[PDB]
């Protein structure tokens, strides 16, 4: 999703569908 939850375990793009995983925000294995 081109975003990282390295600081906070909450991504901006998480709200639209993405999800925080191992510090990186992914959506169905998509960055």
Curated annotation (Swiss-Prot):
Gene Ontology biological-process annotations: defense response to virus
Keyword Ribosomal protein: no
Coiled coil start-end: none
Disulfide pairings: 1-18, 5-20, 11-25
KW Disulfide bond (keyword) present: yes
Domain of life: Eukaryota
Post-translational modification: This is a cyclic peptide.
InterPro entries reported for this sequence: Cyclotide (IPR005535), Cyclotide_bracelet_CS (IPR012323), Cyclotide_sf (IPR036146)
PROSITE patterns: CYCLOTIDE_BRACELET (PS60008)
SUPFAM superfamilies in UniProt: Cyclotides
Pfam family, one: Cyclotide
Record keywords, A-Z: Antiviral defense, Disulfide bond, Knottin, Plant defense
Tissue specificity comment: Expressed in leaves.
Swiss-Prot/TrEMBL domain comment: The presence of a 'disulfide through disulfide knot' structurally defines this protein as a knottin.
Family note: Belongs to the cyclotide family. Bracelet subfamily.
Function: Probably participates in a plant defense mechanism. Has anti-human immunodeficiency virus activity.
Protein name in the entry: Leaf cyclotide 1
């Amino acid at each position: 999703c081109g975003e990282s939850c390295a600081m906070i375990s909450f991504c901006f793009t998480e709200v639209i569908g993405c999800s925080c995983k191992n510090k990186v925000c992914y959506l169905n294995s998509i960055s």
